[PDB]
Enzyme design. Structure first.
Site, PDB file in Angstrom:
ATOM      1  N   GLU B  58      -1.220  15.249  17.037  1.00 63.86           N
ATOM      2  CA  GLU B  58      -0.330  14.122  16.970  1.00 63.86           C
ATOM      3  C   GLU B  58      -0.850  13.002  17.872  1.00 63.86           C
ATOM      4  O   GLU B  58      -0.804  11.825  17.503  1.00 63.86           O
ATOM      5  CB  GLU B  58       1.019  14.639  17.438  1.00 63.86           C
ATOM      6  CG  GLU B  58       0.866  16.012  18.149  1.00 63.86           C
ATOM      7  CD  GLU B  58       1.824  17.065  17.632  1.00 63.86           C
ATOM      8  OE1 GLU B  58       3.016  16.737  17.433  1.00 63.86           O
ATOM      9  OE2 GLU B  58       1.382  18.218  17.438  1.00 63.86           O
ATOM     10  N   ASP B  78       0.342  21.647  17.557  1.00 65.19           N
ATOM     11  CA  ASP B  78       1.665  21.043  17.546  1.00 65.19           C
ATOM     12  C   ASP B  78       2.332  21.542  18.836  1.00 65.19           C
ATOM     13  O   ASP B  78       2.909  22.621  18.861  1.00 65.19           O
ATOM     14  CB  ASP B  78       2.494  21.445  16.337  1.00 65.19           C
ATOM     15  CG  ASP B  78       3.735  20.595  16.220  1.00 65.19           C
ATOM     16  OD1 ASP B  78       3.931  19.750  17.120  1.00 65.19           O
ATOM     17  OD2 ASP B  78       4.511  20.759  15.268  1.00 65.19           O
ATOM     18  N   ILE B  80       5.106  20.902  20.234  1.00 62.76           N
ATOM     19  CA  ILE B  80       6.500  21.266  20.066  1.00 62.76           C
ATOM     20  C   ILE B  80       6.977  20.959  18.669  1.00 62.76           C
ATOM     21  O   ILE B  80       7.107  19.800  18.291  1.00 62.76           O
ATOM     22  CB  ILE B  80       7.440  20.512  21.041  1.00 62.76           C
ATOM     23  CG1 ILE B  80       6.942  20.632  22.481  1.00 62.76           C
ATOM     24  CG2 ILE B  80       8.845  21.073  20.939  1.00 62.76           C
ATOM     25  CD1 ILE B  80       7.855  19.952  23.502  1.00 62.76           C
ATOM     26  N   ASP B  81       7.226  21.998  17.892  1.00 61.90           N
ATOM     27  CA  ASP B  81       7.740  21.808  16.550  1.00 61.90           C
ATOM     28  C   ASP B  81       9.241  22.101  16.644  1.00 61.90           C
ATOM     29  O   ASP B  81       9.649  23.143  17.161  1.00 61.90           O
ATOM     30  CB  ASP B  81       7.075  22.768  15.569  1.00 61.90           C
ATOM     31  CG  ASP B  81       7.588  22.588  14.168  1.00 61.90           C
ATOM     32  OD1 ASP B  81       7.696  23.591  13.428  1.00 61.90           O
ATOM     33  OD2 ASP B  81       7.892  21.426  13.804  1.00 61.90           O
ATOM     34  N   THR B  83      11.508  19.432  17.657  1.00 60.70           N
ATOM     35  CA  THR B  83      11.932  18.578  18.767  1.00 60.70           C
ATOM     36  C   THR B  83      13.360  18.072  18.597  1.00 60.70           C
ATOM     37  O   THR B  83      14.034  17.746  19.575  1.00 60.70           O
ATOM     38  CB  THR B  83      11.041  17.357  18.904  1.00 60.70           C
ATOM     39  OG1 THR B  83      11.244  16.506  17.770  1.00 60.70           O
ATOM     40  CG2 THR B  83       9.577  17.778  19.002  1.00 60.70           C
ATOM     41  N   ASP B 208       1.500  21.141  11.611  1.00 64.72           N
ATOM     42  CA  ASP B 208       2.667  21.987  11.452  1.00 64.72           C
ATOM     43  C   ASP B 208       2.367  23.091  10.455  1.00 64.72           C
ATOM     44  O   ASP B 208       3.178  23.999  10.265  1.00 64.72           O
ATOM     45  CB  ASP B 208       3.868  21.179  10.960  1.00 64.72           C
ATOM     46  CG  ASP B 208       4.510  20.392  12.062  1.00 64.72           C
ATOM     47  OD1 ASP B 208       4.593  20.959  13.163  1.00 64.72           O
ATOM     48  OD2 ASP B 208       4.936  19.232  11.842  1.00 64.72           O
TER      49      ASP B 208
END
Lengths: 249, 258
Positions: B58, B78, B80-81, B83, B208
Site C-alpha cells: 500500500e 497488508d 492491517i486488513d 481497518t 489482500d
C-alpha cells in the site's frame, strides 16, 4: 422473575454452550433438539407456572413469567462450521423483558444483561458506542433464511439506502443474537432486520438496553416482538436515522 | 527462495499481530498510527534482512498504478486488513504477508489477530491453521453454498450499484447464505478451511489476496478471475470456491463493471 432463575439461565446457557461446542466437531439439527429439550425441560421442572416461547401465534407475550429461547442461533453457520453460533435465553415477566443470556459457543463469551443491573460479557461491563453519525456507523444485518423472489428487494433496497448515507461499513455474519451483542459491546453502531423471530431478540434486547443502546421497530416507533422486525442502535439519533433510510416495505 | 524468509514471515505476522492485538484496548487517530507502525516494522526488517527483495504494498504503490509482479523475490504485504473493523473494535482484523518468486505465489501467512489463528500456505507443502492441516469443503451446489464478499472502502453509484447487482445475482441463485465480515483475507482463510464455499469481490488490492491465494490453493480450492478466467493480480478482482464448478457457477452469476 429474578436471580434464582437467572443463574439457571447462565448455567443452562453454559451447558448447551458446551453441548453444541463439542458437537460442532444436513440435520445435525438433533443438536437443536438436545439443547432445547435440555433447557426447556430443566426450566419447566424448576418453574412449572412459567410459560415458554421459543422456536417451537408465536410471540404472544402475557404478563406471566415467560422464557424466550433460541436453542442454537446461527444454524446455517453451525452447518458449515463457520464459527458464529449462540444460545439465547431471554426472560420476561409482567409482559416486559427482565434479563438476557446470550452465549457465543466458539469464542466462549457469556453476554448477559438484567433489568436495572447493567450489561456484561465475561466480567467486563458492556456499554454501546454512542455514535450518531450515520457516516461513521458500522451497521450489522441479516438476510431472511427464507429465499423467495421479491422478499429480496427489501434486502437489496434497504441495504441500498442505508449504504449511501455513507455508512462506514456493513456486516452480515449469519447470527442476529451475536450481531446484536456486537451492538451492546460497541463493536457495531446499529442493527436492523426483517424476519427475525422474537427468540432472537428477547435476550439481546435486555442486554443492549442495559448497555445504553436502544431497540425500536423498523418503523421509527417502539419495538414489537410479534413483528419479527427490529432496529437497534447505539444512540437515538443513529436509531432514528436507521429507521429513516429503512423502507417499511 | 524459501526457509529463512518464511520463518521471517511468521515472526513478523506474529509480532505485528501482537502489537495490534494490544492496541485494540479516541478516533481513527490510532489506527493510522498502528498501520504505519506495523507496516514500517514489517517492511524495514525484511528490506534489511533481504536488501534485494521487492515489495508490493500500500505504501509503495505511490507510483500511481501498481501491483506489477515481476520475476524477482517479492513480498506482497497488508499490515492491517480490516481497518474499519479495527476502528470499531469489531474482532476481525488480520496481518497478511505473501511471497512470490519466479512470478509465482510461493507462500502465504495470514494472522487472525484476536482469535490468534495463524494461517500459512506454501507452494506444494500444504495449507495450515495453528498446526491443523486445512482442506476445503468441496461443496458443489450453489444452493448449499455459504458465500463471502466484501464491499470496498469507496462509496459512489459506480462501485456501489455493482456490489448490489452482484449481490442480487448471487442471491438470485439459491445460495444458502452470504457473509460480509470486513476482511477479505480472513473471508478467504474461511474458504480455505472449509467454513465457507466461495468468495468474490471487485476492487480488492492484490496484497489482500496474495498470501490468501497460496492458502486456498494449498488447501484444495481454486482461485480465479471474476470473468472466470485465470486470476489476475492486476485486475483487483476475484472468485474463489472449493470446487471448479462452484467457482464457475459464481462467475456465471456476476459479470463485470458494466
Amino acid at each position: 422473575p429474578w436471580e434464582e432463575c437467572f443463574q439457571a439461565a447462565v448455567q443452562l446457557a453454559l451447558r448447551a454452550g458446551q453441548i453444541i461446542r463439542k458437537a460442532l466437531t444436513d440435520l445435525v439439527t438433533e443438536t437443536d433438539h438436545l439443547v432445547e429439550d435440555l433447557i426447556i425441560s430443566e426450566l419447566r421442572e424448576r418453574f412449572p407456572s412459567h410459560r415458554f416461547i421459543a422456536e417451537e401465534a408465536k410471540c404472544v407475550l402475557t404478563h406471566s413469567p415467560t422464557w424466550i429461547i433460541d436453542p442454537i442461533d446461527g444454524t446455517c453457520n453451525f452447518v458449515h462450521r463457520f464459527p458464529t453460533v449462540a444460545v439465547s435465553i431471554g426472560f420476561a415477566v409482567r409482559q416486559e423483558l427482565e434479563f438476557g443470556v446470550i452465549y457465543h459457543c466458539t469464542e466462549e463469551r457469556l453476554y448477559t444483561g438484567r433489568r436495572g443491573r447493567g450489561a456484561f460479557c465475561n466480567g467486563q461491563r458492556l456499554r454501546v458506542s454512542g455514535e450518531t453519525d450515520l457516516s461513521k456507523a458500522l451497521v450489522l444485518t441479516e438476510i431472511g433464511p427464507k429465499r423467495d423472489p421479491a422478499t429480496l428487494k427489501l434486502f437489496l433496497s434497504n441495504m441500498e439506502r442505508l449504504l449511501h448515507a455513507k455508512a462506514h461499513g456493513v456486516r452480515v455474519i449469519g447470527s442476529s443474537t451475536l450481531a446484536l451483542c456486537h451492538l451492546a459491546s460497541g463493536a457495531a453502531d446499529a442493527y436492523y432486520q426483517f424476519g427475525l423471530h422474537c427468540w432472537d431478540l428477547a435476550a439481546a434486547t435486555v442486554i443492549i438496553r442495559e448497555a445504553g443502546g436502544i431497540v425500536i421497530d423498523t418503523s421509527g416507533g417502539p419495538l414489537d416482538l410479534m413483528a419479527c422486525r427490529v432496529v437497534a442502535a447505539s444512540t437515538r439519533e443513529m436509531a432514528m436515522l436507521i429507521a429513516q433510510a429503512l423502507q417499511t416495505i
